[PDB]
Amino acid sequence: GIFGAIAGFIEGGWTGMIDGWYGYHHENSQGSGYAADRESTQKAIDGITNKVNSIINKMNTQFEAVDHEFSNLERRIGNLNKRMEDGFLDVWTYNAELLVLLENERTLDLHDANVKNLYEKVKSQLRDNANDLGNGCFEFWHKCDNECMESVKNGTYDYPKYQKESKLNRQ
Amino acid sequence: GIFGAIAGFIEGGWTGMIDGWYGYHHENSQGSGYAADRESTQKAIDGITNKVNSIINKMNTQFEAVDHEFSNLERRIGNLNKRMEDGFLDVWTYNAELLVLLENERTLDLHDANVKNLYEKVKSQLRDNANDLGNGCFEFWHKCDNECMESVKNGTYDYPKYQKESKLNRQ
Amino acid sequence: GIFGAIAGFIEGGWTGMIDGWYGYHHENSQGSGYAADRESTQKAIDGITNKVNSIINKMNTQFEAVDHEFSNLERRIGNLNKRMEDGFLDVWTYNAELLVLLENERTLDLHDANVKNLYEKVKSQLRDNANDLGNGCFEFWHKCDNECMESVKNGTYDYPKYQKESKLNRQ
Amino acid sequence: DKICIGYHANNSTTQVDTLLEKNVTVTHSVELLENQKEKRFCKIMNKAPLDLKDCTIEGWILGNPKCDLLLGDQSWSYIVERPNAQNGICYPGVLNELEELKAFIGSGERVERFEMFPKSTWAGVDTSRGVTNACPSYTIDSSFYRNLVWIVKTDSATYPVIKGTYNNTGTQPILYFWGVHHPLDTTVQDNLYGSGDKYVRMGTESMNFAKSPEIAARPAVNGQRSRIDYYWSVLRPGETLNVESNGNLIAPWYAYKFVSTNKKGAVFKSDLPIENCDATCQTITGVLRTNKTFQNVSPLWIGECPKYVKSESLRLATGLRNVPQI
Amino acid sequence: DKICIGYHANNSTTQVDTLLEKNVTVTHSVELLENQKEKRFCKIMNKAPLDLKDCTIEGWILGNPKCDLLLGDQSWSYIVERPNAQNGICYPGVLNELEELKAFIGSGERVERFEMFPKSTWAGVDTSRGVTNACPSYTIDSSFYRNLVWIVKTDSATYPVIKGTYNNTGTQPILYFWGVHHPLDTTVQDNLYGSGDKYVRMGTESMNFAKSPEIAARPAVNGQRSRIDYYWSVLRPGETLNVESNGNLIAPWYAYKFVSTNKKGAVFKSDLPIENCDATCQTITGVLRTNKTFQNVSPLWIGECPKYVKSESLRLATGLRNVPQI
Amino acid sequence: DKICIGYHANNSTTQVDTLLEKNVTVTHSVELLENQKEKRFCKIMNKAPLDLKDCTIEGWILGNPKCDLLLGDQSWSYIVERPNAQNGICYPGVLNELEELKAFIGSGERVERFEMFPKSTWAGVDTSRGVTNACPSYTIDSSFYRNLVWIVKTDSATYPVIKGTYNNTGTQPILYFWGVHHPLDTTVQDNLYGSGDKYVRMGTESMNFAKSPEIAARPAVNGQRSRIDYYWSVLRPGETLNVESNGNLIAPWYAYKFVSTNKKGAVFKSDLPIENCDATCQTITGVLRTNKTFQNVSPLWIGECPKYVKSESLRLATGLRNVPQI
Ligand SMILES: *[C@@H]1O[C@H](CO)[C@@H](O[C@@H]2O[C@H](CO)[C@@H](O[C@@H]3O[C@H](CO[C@H]4O[C@H](CO)[C@@H](O)[C@H](O)[C@@H]4O)[C@@H](O)[C@H](O[C@H]4O[C@H](CO)[C@@H](O)[C@H](O)[C@@H]4O)[C@@H]3O)[C@H](O)[C@H]2NC(C)=O)[C@H](O[C@H]2O[C@@H](C)[C@@H](O)[C@@H](O)[C@@H]2O)[C@H]1NC(C)=O
Ligand SMILES: *[C@@H]1O[C@H](CO)[C@@H](O[C@@H]2O[C@H](CO)[C@@H](O[C@@H]3O[C@H](CO[C@H]4O[C@H](CO)[C@@H](O)[C@H](O)[C@@H]4O)[C@@H](O)[C@H](O[C@H]4O[C@H](CO)[C@@H](O)[C@H](O)[C@@H]4O)[C@@H]3O)[C@H](O)[C@H]2NC(C)=O)[C@H](O[C@H]2O[C@@H](C)[C@@H](O)[C@@H](O)[C@@H]2O)[C@H]1NC(C)=O
Ligand SMILES: *[C@@H]1O[C@H](CO)[C@@H](O[C@@H]2O[C@H](CO)[C@@H](O[C@@H]3O[C@H](CO[C@H]4O[C@H](CO)[C@@H](O)[C@H](O)[C@@H]4O)[C@@H](O)[C@H](O[C@H]4O[C@H](CO)[C@@H](O)[C@H](O)[C@@H]4O)[C@@H]3O)[C@H](O)[C@H]2NC(C)=O)[C@H](O[C@H]2O[C@@H](C)[C@@H](O)[C@@H](O)[C@@H]2O)[C@H]1NC(C)=O
Ligand SMILES: *[C@@H]1O[C@H](CO)[C@@H](O)[C@H](O)[C@H]1NC(C)=O
Ligand SMILES: *[C@@H]1O[C@H](CO)[C@@H](O)[C@H](O)[C@H]1NC(C)=O
Ligand SMILES: *[C@@H]1O[C@H](CO)[C@@H](O)[C@H](O)[C@H]1NC(C)=O
Ligand SMILES: *[C@@H]1O[C@H](CO)[C@@H](O)[C@H](O)[C@H]1NC(C)=O
Ligand SMILES: *[C@@H]1O[C@H](CO)[C@@H](O)[C@H](O)[C@H]1NC(C)=O
Ligand SMILES: *[C@@H]1O[C@H](CO)[C@@H](O)[C@H](O)[C@H]1NC(C)=O
Ligand SMILES: *[C@@H]1O[C@H](CO)[C@@H](O)[C@H](O)[C@H]1NC(C)=O
Ligand SMILES: *[C@@H]1O[C@H](CO)[C@@H](O)[C@H](O)[C@H]1NC(C)=O
Ligand SMILES: *[C@@H]1O[C@H](CO)[C@@H](O)[C@H](O)[C@H]1NC(C)=O
Ligand SMILES: *[C@@H]1O[C@H](CO)[C@@H](O)[C@H](O)[C@H]1NC(C)=O
Ligand SMILES: *[C@@H]1O[C@H](CO)[C@@H](O)[C@H](O)[C@H]1NC(C)=O
Ligand SMILES: *[C@@H]1O[C@H](CO)[C@@H](O)[C@H](O)[C@H]1NC(C)=O
């Protein structure tokens, strides 16, 4: 995809992570588990919901065909009505089908970007205190307990705190 | 946002930088200041201006309703005219409102990407001669005077020139 | 551009690479040459072809004007037909011209992203076994023969194999 | 010790198309289009439709003797006319501006039938013998329209100038009908109306009407080579109608107080059953009970309906590309 | 020593909506839609509109005696007709193909009035007594249309065949009018036109017209139970009109050289004031002075106007998400 | 030792526009719009068009004596009418519901001419002298329409009631024509039809027609101050026509079995040559031979054509921004 994450450098999704669209899987001495990133997921839910509702609202008018009849000597106005009604039917069918194809492409890209940005946000915090495996996973050069893990996930990871310990194991 | 810079890893904008959309803030012995990146800003102004003018040009036709009257025995053609006029009014209202929502989303993304790309362009020049603070700021491992600063801004920064000095301070 | 690669940190294209949209140029003891990345190129050809065919399919209806005549006492319905026919002509002209401008912008961005993602994919494999020159080129810290080159291109490059040799030359 | 960044996958097999790619499986999506219908007619806004059954629109408001089931007051949310309905214009002839009449009736929600011109209106003529075997009732072989009076001359006497007037003092417009008889030959002409140039003339503040009989033989229809020219008009509130004729007049007898709807009007020509049920959206081919934005059922409807398109499906992705492992 | 990359912020509180997010504050934006109007009528291309004031279109081109202010030559960029205008068809009757006549007049920019048939045209009849209390002037109680002549028989004499002809040798089409009188009874018929079957017949290279009087009493309007059938037509350049009648003719007297516009035509029905001002875009509800692309004022206009939509606002972002610190 | 990532460039100078940028050179692109045409008419679905040449539509189906080249059976994929065609309605008069007649004929693909009423049909009258110098053949100065019979009285005798009937027992509708003669004066009226009130009355199961002559002098056209009112109708399968007249009848003689097309119908008014060639898409201004999606040639066409737009070009980028070095 466009941002290279979904079905990209992160080859597949997690059926194990059921409570959000994007998130984390950690492993430490206390074991392993899945956790959704609540902020990025909710932000995406709000955006996508807004998109759907906006499309619904813009599509909220109707063209109305009539039951009116035309006589044998009214072929021209009868045909005028038919071509008009068919005309708007073709316009709106086009508008609906084209929009769906376009927005589906962009919606999937949006998800792709959000995963990529989440990955970058973690990379940025950890720096050289961890090793990037290239598949969205990071191996710590230090022991990272549950609160250390949670600090990574909520954006408050303390790089200086683990720097020296990481440097020693790295070297 | 989609590219992660605006209201992203760069949390906020600069009211201090009044002469461009994207740019720099530097600090050295001679003090500190804001400067717009003229090239990226102008390129964006040209693009966005072109987009606005293109939308205006495509919207440059008008459907025209008429003042024509219809008698009591012309209910069908009278109603035909009304549904037609209402029909085009609904189509164009849709076209205008949907386009504005779509383009506003993409325009903001464009700005987001340009900031991200500007950040990358600086990161690429500086390499390990500077420390990336994660907020769009770089701390030099060497003294960088006004001409050094300006070389970073105009893309001609000399990495080898400051390499040895940076290496020593880094280590 | 939006992803910063095409006419970006990779300043220009290769007339030398004639068999694909994206790819590689290598140099080693056995000489130098161009090679297309077949997977990313084909994936893009499939996508773009699908886009063109989808646009063609959505544009596959026609509004039909008629040869019908109207008398001197049929000015109103005659004018109704004209404004209707002109109305749909304006709608479809708008739809076609706007779509082409929009999709051309996005198609070029798609190519830009694919080049960027290809670059990232190589950067990720090589790590510090090579030096990034900032122009899409990587200089190996080790000898990389034809099969090493091909392993980089097909995603199976062996970082541990060349690690020690690269480390020594790097230091 | 490890942490990984990743994304949701599930067991979804639901797919969407994009400009770049067809058949993409996604974790979540929403279908915007409705393709299901209940094949029946229901009430709209708690108001039942009018089933014309074996009568056509003409048979109904003209008062064809076999349409007595419909006769009188009616209220409707819409009209259902059956395709093979047999009871229309029984005595052969053209109902003028028929399509406009249907459009008018369709724009209404109620008619109240009343006697506009009692037979006493027409002084020197016979109002009791205007029946024909072309227009049978269910019980008698020769009858006539309940809203019209076929006037003929009294025995041997001449057919005099007859006059009638009606002042609409009410607040509602009045839909009424009348006719001009065209006999197949001068013999029938003299037998029924006597001799001399005949005319039918009518007028209001805004309308003039004048017609004379045109004697000729047309192919037999329902046993008749003669014809009637039927007409309709609308007497506005405050307007007065004047009728004047010296013969060949099919006179207005009963008419309708007409109540025009502020909503959309509909006339559905269908064989579908009307059942005891409610609906907010009624199409000519059935009821739509849906929250969806689009529908591919029918462009013809009354009530609040989704937008009609030709599409089979309009599914939006909301979730992401579904890539479950394994 | 530091360098940072960043983006512009300012004091803007102006917001836009996107598909993903509503109420987004941006540093720069442009409003594409115009919602302001000047509530008045101005000149279009330095040409003033025609105010019909207390006269309707019919009163004007028929020459209703109370419309003398309008009488004669007129040039206009568009027409303003006032809603409560009282001076129309004074002597009761229908002006046939009225809607088409309005559409035709609307397609013009100028009429030149001239005498098409001087009263001398009609030999054996009286052209001096055709007045009625239904059509008063401002100074006299009984008058008539300035463009028509109500012809009656001379004292006691019979009403003969009268004839008239006009050959349009000019380069412009001619808009003209005529009528057929329908008396309420045979007494008035004989008093005015004598006895015998009456006709009005007219023709050109491309038109035939024939009508006879239809005697009957209609509800009184402006004191009259009689009626006139008014007619109009257009005599093309090079065409000739022949008039022939033995009675009941409301004759053409004055007509108009008609100049058709190459621009759009307009007839605005409004109470808005016409002032001394210029405009490039004039809608039925007011002037638009704007550089904007869209407008939500009115779909009805003349001149160069923005596209009409129902939208309240169409604001495009040009700058970026405004995130000022603090 | 080096490896670089990069992208394709070539010698393309072909450009596209985007929302952000005009005149962008791209390595690959596809033009969606067709602006080329063959300026000629070809066959559509192996079926040739009908060239009316020097005859108009009226001249053709009325049977103007100078249109004998067209006379009889015709099959067509579409109709070409030439702008300066001279042979139309030769004896002056109006063909009623002309525009509807053209729309009807346009909806057809074939007519079969047959004798509907042989001259023997009309008993007491003369069918041999109905010719006029207004309607010359190519060989004789005075002729008449091949599909009509101008009936006049026999020497000195009165003009009696004539009658005719035709029962359409076939499966195809029948297009037929008739007329009513209006002499310039009572002298011609008496000379041709004798004295007394004259009528023309016709009828079917679904149609009534009645007209009487209207005597008056109109400006001379093709030497005639008299007129004919021409009429047309369609006799449905199973319907019967009855004709009855005591004078002034231009009688139906030959008529057409009418075959209606299921495709789109077209009547192209053009000077373009019809050649020996095939096409799948034929516009009024020429043939389109293209695989393209849009065209800016013409909105008027028959066959399978690209969508018409006003655009000069609709080029989609498929490849990428072309940035060749050097
Ligand atoms: C992002 O995620 C991190 C990790 O989970 C979270 O930080 C933890 O927050 C909790 C609760 O605020 C902290 O628990 C308290 O810890 C203090 C500090 O003493 C201990 O921690 C230090 C390390 O900083 C050790 O060196 C010491 O030896 C101690 O083990 C402790 O005093 C306190 O106990 C008092 O308060 C209790 C309240 O229930 C009371 O019951 C008790 O009797 C005591 O009076 C808590 O036990 C935990 O230490 C934090 N971990 C770290 C590594 O800092 C972030 O949330 C908070 O972060 C802290 C730093 C504050 O800034 C709060 O305002 C944050 O809300 C979380 N951030 C976000 C934004 O979600
Ligand atoms: C991107 O931004 C950089 C930084 O501002 C800019 O480079 C500077 O450009 C200016 C003007 O071209 C240079 O000023 C001249 O410097 C030379 C060199 O001597 C001094 O610099 C070197 C470092 O390279 C020191 O080691 C020496 O000790 C000196 O201090 C100097 O000879 C010259 O003086 C002559 O010319 C004067 C003209 O007014 C004249 O008055 C005087 O009497 C002398 O005859 C200038 O003073 C400055 O040195 C550059 N700085 C650096 C670090 O290189 C880039 O613009 C130019 O860059 C140089 C390298 C050239 O390639 C020009 O073509 C560029 O235009 C700027 N680039 C872009 C693209 O915007
Ligand atoms: C991505 O690109 C790489 C590089 O081109 C490619 O890997 C090469 O694949 C070829 C063919 O599969 C290998 O050639 C065989 O090599 C074996 C191994 O011995 C030699 O290689 C090792 C290094 O691994 C050296 O240390 C030794 O000293 C040897 O030089 C060799 O036994 C074999 O010879 C037998 O098979 C011949 C079949 O024709 C037969 O003729 C002969 O008599 C022998 O019985 C081949 O010569 C080559 O070594 C690979 N290079 C490397 C660096 O691994 C990838 O394709 C394959 O990769 C290997 C590792 C397997 O996993 C295959 O399944 C892959 O298809 C390519 N990958 C993709 C996905 O395109
Ligand atoms: C998917 O799994 C859920 C349980 O999480 C199950 O209830 C549902 O039936 C499954 N649906 C499909 C389509 O596999
Ligand atoms: C993909 O779409 C095609 C349409 O050609 C359909 O036949 C097929 O069922 C789809 N494939 C799936 C659902 O795996
Ligand atoms: C018309 O022809 C059919 C078929 O022969 C016949 O049954 C019918 O009686 C005829 N009707 C008339 C009115 O001639
Ligand atoms: C009806 O529409 C709502 C709108 O959000 C949707 O969420 C809901 O699932 C739909 N109802 C059913 C029963 O599917
Ligand atoms: C914004 O600030 C400018 C000064 O830069 C001032 O002139 C203007 O009034 C302010 N506008 C708003 C809307 O705050
Ligand atoms: C956001 O838009 C809402 C519309 O519901 C409006 O009421 C409100 O003023 C806006 N909020 C602002 C301008 O802060
Ligand atoms: C109609 O009735 C009203 C109300 O009584 C009356 O004032 C008016 O004179 C009547 N007009 C006619 C023509 O009968
Ligand atoms: C009118 O439109 C121009 C078009 O660019 C715009 O720049 C200008 O600000 C507008 N004029 C005013 C007075 O706002
Ligand atoms: C481009 O180069 C090809 C050879 O690769 C040549 O055949 C062709 O004529 C050239 N076209 C243009 C437009 O330069
Ligand atoms: C760019 O487009 C312009 C349109 O104004 C055209 O005149 C010119 O030829 C184009 N430039 C090229 C093809 O280099
Ligand atoms: C009409 O006037 C022209 C120009 O003088 C003349 O040639 C022509 O004969 C006239 N025709 C009639 C019918 O008066
Ligand atoms: C006609 O259209 C096809 C559709 O793919 C296209 O590939 C081909 O190049 C076109 N033919 C010619 C001769 O250009």
Author numbering:
A (entry chain B), B (entry chain B), C (entry chain B): 1 to 171
D (entry chain A), E (entry chain A), F (entry chain A): 1 to 326
The authors write:
Receptor-binding specificity of HA is a key determinant for viral host range. HA molecules of human viruses preferentially bind to α(2,6)-linked receptors, those of avian viruses to α(2,3)-linked receptors, while those of swine viruses to both. Two H6 HA proteins, one from each group, were chosen for structural and functional investigation: A/chicken/Guangdong/S1311/2010(H6N6) (GD H6) in Group I and A/Taiwan/2/2013(H6N1) (TW H6) in Group II.
Furthermore, the TW H6 virus caused the first case of H6-mediated human infection. In sharp contrast, TW H6 HA has similar equilibrium dissociation constants for both types of receptors, 0.4 μM for 3’SLNLN and 0.27 μM for 6’SLNLN. We found that the HA protein from the human-infecting A/Taiwan/2/2013(H6N1) virus, TW H6 HA, already possesses slight preference for human receptors, thus may act as an intermediate towards a complete human adaptation. The overall structures of GD and TW H6 HAs are very similar, where the root-mean-square deviation (RMSD) for all Cα atoms is at 0.67 Å. Within the receptor-binding site, GD and TW H6 HAs differ at multiple key locations. Comparison of the receptor-binding sites of different A/HA subtypes of influenza virus reveals that H6 (both GD and TW), H1 and H5 HAs have a bulge in the 130-loop with the main-chain carboxyl group of HA1 133 pointing into the receptor-binding site, likely as a result of the one-residue insertion between HA1 130 and 131 relative to H3 HA.
